[model samples]
Target: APRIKLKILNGSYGIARLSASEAIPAWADGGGFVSITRTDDELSIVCLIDRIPQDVRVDPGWSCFKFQGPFAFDETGIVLSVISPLSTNGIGIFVVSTFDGDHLLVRSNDLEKTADLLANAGHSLLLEHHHHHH
Candidate 1:
C-alpha cells in the first residue's frame, strides 16, 4: 500500500443532526471544514464547533484529519487503508469525501492516538502548527 499524507485542521469541530425540514443554518458557512448532507430523513452538518448554533443538537469535540490529494476518482482502497489502522485501535471516525480527497473526523481526545496509529502504518501526520497551504 502507498503511504498517505494527513494534516490536522485547526480547531475543534462538530457534527449536527437537525430536522429534515429545516433550512441550512446561517452559522454553518464559515468553518474551514464545513460539510452538509440532507435527505428525507434528516439534515446533517459538520463544521467548526464554535460555528454550530447553540440551539442545534451537535456532537461536538471532533478533530479533522485531512488526507492530501487531488486523487483520481478511480483509485481504490485509499480510504480503507487509512481507516483500517484506526479501526484496529478501536478509534471511530466520521468521514466526508470531496472530489479532490477525503477528510476523517476523529474524537478530539483520540487525535493523538489516531495519528500515532497512522504513523505506525507509514503515513505522514502533519500537526496543526506545521500545516501549510498547498
Candidate 2:
C-alpha cells in the first residue's frame, strides 16, 4: 500500500438512510463534510451529525479523515492505505472517494486508535487543532 497524508475534519458526522424514492433533502446540502449516494435500494447521506434529521434511520458519531488529494485515478492502493492497518486491527471504516481525493470516517471511539495505526503505517494525519513535528 502507498503512504499518504490526511486531515481530520472539524466535526463528527453521521450516515442516514432514506427511501430510494426520496429526493435529496435540502438540509443535507452545504454541511461540512457531506456526501450523497443513491442506489435502487436506498439513498445514503453522510454529513455532519447535527445535519441528520431525527426522522430517518441514522448512525452518528463518525470522525472523518480527508486524504491529501489530486492522486491519479490510475494510481492504486488508496483503499489499501486505509484498510490494511485499521481493518486488520478490527477497526471498521466508512470511506468516500471524490474526484480529487478520498475520505475515511472511523467511529468516534476509534479515532485515537486509527491515528496510532495510520502513523505506524507511515501515513500522516494533519489534525485540525494540534501539531506534531515529526
Candidate 3:
C-alpha cells in the first residue's frame, strides 16, 4: 500500500442530517472545512461544531484527519489503506472524499490513538503544531 501523509485539522466537528425541506443554514459557512450533500430524502452537513448553532441538532465531538493529496482518480487503494488499519485497531471512521483528497473523522477521544496507530503502520501523521497555514 502507498504511504499517505495525514494531518490533523484545527477544530472539533459535527455531522447533521436534515430533511430535504430544510434549507441549508448560513452558519455552515466559515468552517475550517465543510461538506454538504443533498439527496431526494435528506441533506447531510458536516462542519466545525463551533460553527453550528446551539439549537441545531448534530453528531458532535468529531475530530478530522486530512489526507494530504491531490490524489488522481485512478489512484487505487488510497482510502482503503488508511481505513483498513484503523479498522483493525477497532477505531470507527467517518470519511469524506472530495475531488482533491479525503478527510477522516473519528471521535475526539480517539484522535491521538488513531494517530499513533497510523504512524506505527507507516503513514506520515502530522499533528496540528506542524501544519502549514493556508
**All-Cα superposition RMSD per candidate:** 3.4, 4.3, 3.2
Ranking by TM-score: 1, 2, 3
Off by over 4 Å in 2: 72-75, 130-134
Model 3 lDDT per residue over 1-134, tens place: 77889988887789987777888888776749899889998888899887877776688989888899666546579999899999988999999998787999999998888888888878998785533557
- The prediction achieving the highest lDDT against the true structure is 1
Model 3: pairs clashing at backbone N, Cα or C within 3 Å:
none
Per-residue lDDT for 107 in model 3? 93
* Per-candidate local distance difference test: 0.86, 0.85, 0.84
Per-residue lDDT tens digits of candidate 1, residues 6-66? 9888878899999999999888788498998999899999998877877889999999878
Model 1 scores worst on lDDT over the 10 consecutive residues at 125-134
- Could you estimate the TM-score for every candidate? 0.90, 0.89, 0.87
Better of 2 and 3 by TM-score: 2
Sort order, lDDT high to low: 1, 2, 3
- Extract clashing residue pairs from model 2: none
Q: In every candidate, how many clashes are there?
A: 0, 0, 0
**Residue ranges of candidate 1 with Cα displaced over 4 Å:** 72-75, 130-134
